[PDB]
Symmetry: D2
Subunit: 363 residues, 4 copies
């Protein structure tokens, strides 16, 4: 085939630099791009009514954590509303994040849509006018974006259709981002829903990723200016087989080594419905795996970095300092974790708390 | 692989019925879906200021044009603006069309966007919210839609990526439409620009169509509930070679016979920068080809059906009866053409166009 | 892309002529190309011992049937061995065949082989050295070839790998055949084994045949100069639900008209384990189905045209006449069948030999 | 997808072993797979009789070299002939190779063949009976095999077909090799022929490889049990611009990082028609490239290890001492190069490269 410089060296320079800053040694990502709706249940959980102000404040709470979080957070995925919201001190959220050493992020997908003829599978939308938006968001403070595609494992899923479609949508999305100076975090989120073993998930993960990487190659994407955001190869949420953090870690590292080429600046795993602690133990075990990992393996957590903070906050602004603490210890815990220097109080922190399924009540 | 009913028999029926109604023996499609910009330039030529009114009036002139066009026009491709405009008699445009026998359609795509890393190649956007749009358009009288894709022929074009991205994006649109009871008109538009000969165009057309259909198959698209709207295989507008009308017909039909499956209800050719007569005679010649054509080959002309009526209405309302008549004529001419019974034979005679390329001045 | 002619007008021409000769109105194909191991099975099934003479004679049994058979046999598929054998009169077998008005055929594949990582799926070999073998064959009076790919239905079959793999080998074999002046018969054989319903067999067929033509397109195969040899869309052999010939017919033609383009000269069906009568009644019904079929829908029968010939022969060289008459009857029956004018001398009447399963059914 | 185990843990482990030890620290591969044809030309260049004994001797010359070479060579690719040839002591070469710590290889493809409808493109055969050959070869000591696929660079080549075709064939042989305990070496040989520049050769390389790893993936190939034998990214042999060895290295490393996943044991580069010294120098700088290389980067040279050694043989059975030193010289030189420990030597001399040209010597 014939080359056609999609990006000039000048453009390629910036993309790679921005990519690195986010995943620099120890650094991670706080995914707080919860849409006004997905955050509604979060706010309701503690009794706080989903109001413009309540939202702004909670976003600020995490964002105003004292300087201890600085060496912990490399980037923060923001939501459109949040991006234009300001902190009490007059300074707008992106500027706040700026001063704290982190790269600002923004979500660009418009949600999921069903695929006719499939077993309830989906694809994601958000391309129409994405270039126009990227151009604006960039000028308004963001440098990296996030687009989420979902895939279900099951009896007949994922199908070749779901795989090939999403891979292609992510490529389109990626192509647009890089044209507007924005590092695209690609998110092939294979949901851990079902009673599938570790291998089954590993198989699917190796497959979905192998498709994604061929898609980006077709659409001429600058790999060193991207970041993968996959789910860890963990057993299906209803599996009756006991697995150790070393196994999920090994299976996750193998799958990535088999599909993600070394030119990918870094893999930012997300919490597969995992608890704050577990997420950290696993991330740590991943970084301790003897297998040569050519890329930065860090985090991009929403709940794992918020759960206790949102809880402590509990609407009571008096709790502000307490809530910010639960967040910072989590940030520190994970920053250590993404280096294999995290000690979960003696090598086994979160142990299996009454495994409802494996036990005997799942027979 | 395993089945998953994208469309129930009830839905399958409605789709094929609306499709055959449009391409009924003799009937054709009127394309009056010019964007406010495309119609603007058109109105400039006759000396008419581009306002919502003059557009509404122009669209009206064609719509309420005698009852003689009734057996000629099976459907009209409308524009968003026009779908909500009323005729002087306080009657909605989609209502005049239905009463006069035609099926109302609409343009849905939101235009073309550049694909990075290609030589000026493109793709088409419009998938965001297509379902919500098709559900409303459905409730408003429309029953079919149009999505145009552009594919330029050149040194290294069309490329694997442009052919694949466009093929796939068309297939997505068809899925959504059909889900909402709309019959999709697949439009893989290969531009007749360049000095490329006839055969080159016949090569790329087979290649484009072959891709397009595999994409429809993959997405579980009900072929019987669709229509193709390709250009006639013709030499580029800079070819210095003289081609007979019998040749255009043969290249076109051979290409379609080789790619389009029999189940495709009908092929509605577009004008392709051709004059009103030339379009009529080429459509006719195509229908007279000795080869077996398992689908209705008809017209879907915009310019080749409005050129004479348009210039015959330089804003002056008095030119009503006169202007509307040129339309009736072209409608009747093409109705004979889409049956192979159009008396105007030969090639030109006392008809011709800029022979500058097919002459010494192009050497 | 650049139009690179794979064949000249001369070569295109020859293949088209040959293909049309085989599928001419009323004419079908006698598949008499069993391997020494396949024919050996059939011999002991009637108490005959496998031998070159017994094979030669038996092949001669069919090949010399009275002249009422001439108008029925458009082509005969031979095995490598028989292509080189002579008749009792001294005339080489290809000569006798050519004297009755048929085109000579030769199987050119070297059997199926396993695809690793699949669920007992296969692919086919025989590609190595094709050009040289085909050339020899073409010279030795063989104008067309056959290549069998065996696909199969199960809860996870046929898988993408199997589908695109078998499809790609077909396009390769075809490419080589036409390059040497031999019209290739694409045999995408979906096994009738299993208890899948008609809906399942039809859904599969559409996906398979879709992949096959996209592939044939990629490899630059001249469709007009190729014949398809698919299985009739019927339910699985273990399927406990009985279907009417109209349904089998409907599903057969529907799937076909949805995937096979009109440019394909013919579709020579194979009777997957059907009795002599069934094969005829179904082929007859398929030819009476109201839907528009732009290609010849004939037969390419093996046991449907040999069950009684073998049975009546019984080894006795004296029973030859009864045996030839049996063959002639089925041929004449199918010559009509492929014209939808067959004499239903069935209604549950055709030699009851064996049914299904494996328990106590050696060979 | 659906996980159907292609290899057992035992097989996977064994393949990983065989592979890891071929590219072990400081080790490389000797290409002694010269078909009777290729080797014949090399012999004529020095004026020799192309006799089985001469071919046997010339190779015994390289195989029974002094132990200094033992640490440099991890494997030797042999032609079918040599695998069954014995050294003077009455011991087959496969054993003489195993004794010195090296692993014996074997060429299994039957050569290239043209692809109808392309611009001089080809594909490779050798799949028929490959499992049988692999099984036997595994019995004769051969632990790894080799399959060559040639890709050409031109105005419109390679084409999608060429890429997809070869990538799919390499993946076929890989699945079979691994199916018989043989570590396959996928050799995607992109020809150095042409005038294309460095950037162009790199673009193409990434594209080809990406397709090759997608194919391998679809085919369930166990990557860890395979090697990669590509050419170094270099400008066409007729290119006017001269590039620094750093540039060869840079484009080579960047290209491979972009398309070869970490899981691939190693890359064994080809001489590509370079001088013995240039091959060493280039390979040296490829290993000294500041970018992270998660895979062994060694050699798999033929003439770059045999050129001077062959010239220092002539045709008399005593120059053995001379010929051997040259082989050992080159093998030691490259052993250092594949670690970044190669002191770039000088020239100022005639050296020993290729055959005769317009340049005379006396007569």
């Amino acid at each position: 085939p014939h080359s056609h410089p999609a990006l000039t060296p000048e453009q390629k320079k910036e993309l790679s630099d921005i990519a690195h800053r986010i995943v620099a040694p120890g650094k991670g990502i706080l995914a707080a791009d919860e849409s006004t709706g997905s955050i509604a249940k979060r706010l309701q959980s503690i009794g706080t009514e989903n109001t413009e102000e309540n939202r702004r404040f909670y976003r600020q709470l995490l964002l105003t954590a004292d300087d201890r979080v600085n060496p912990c957070i490399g980037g923060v995925i923001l939501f459109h509303e949040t991006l234009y919201q300001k902190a009490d001190d007059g300074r707008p959220f992106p500027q706040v994040i700026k001063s704290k050493g982190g790269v600002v992020g923004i979500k660009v997908d418009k949600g999921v849509v069903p695929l006719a003829g499939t077993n309830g599978e989906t694809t994601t939308q958000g391309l129409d006018g994405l270039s126009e938006r990227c151009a604006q968001y960039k000028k308004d403070g963001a440098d990296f974006a996030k687009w989420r595609c979902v895939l279900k494992i099951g009896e007949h899923t994922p199908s070749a259709l779901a795989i090939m479609e999403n891979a292609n949508v992510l490529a389109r999305y990626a192509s647009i981002c890089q044209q507007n100076g924005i590092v695209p975090i690609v998110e092939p989120e294979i949901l851990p829903d079902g009673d599938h073993d570790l291998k089954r998930c590993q198989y699917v993960t190796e497959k979905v990723l192998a498709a994604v990487y061929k898609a980006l190659s077709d659409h001429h994407i600058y790999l060193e200016g991207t970041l993968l955001m996959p789910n860890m190869v963990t057993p299906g949420h209803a599996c009756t087989q006991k697995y150790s953090h070393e196994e999920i870690a090994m299976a996750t590292v193998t799958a990535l080594r088999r599909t993600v080429p070394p030119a990918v600046t870094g893999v930012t795993f997300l919490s597969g419905g995992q608890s704050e602690e577990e997420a950290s133990i696993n991330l740590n075990a991943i970084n301790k795996c003897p297998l040569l990992k050519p890329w930065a393996l860090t985090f991009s957590y929403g709940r794992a970095l918020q759960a206790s903070a949102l809880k402590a906050w509990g609407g009571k602004k008096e709790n502000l300092k307490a809530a910010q603490e639960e967040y910072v210890k989590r940030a520190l815990a994970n920053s250590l974790a993404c280096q294999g220097k995290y000690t979960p109080s003696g090598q086994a922190g979160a142990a299996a708390s009454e495994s409802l399924f494996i036990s005997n009540h799942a027979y």
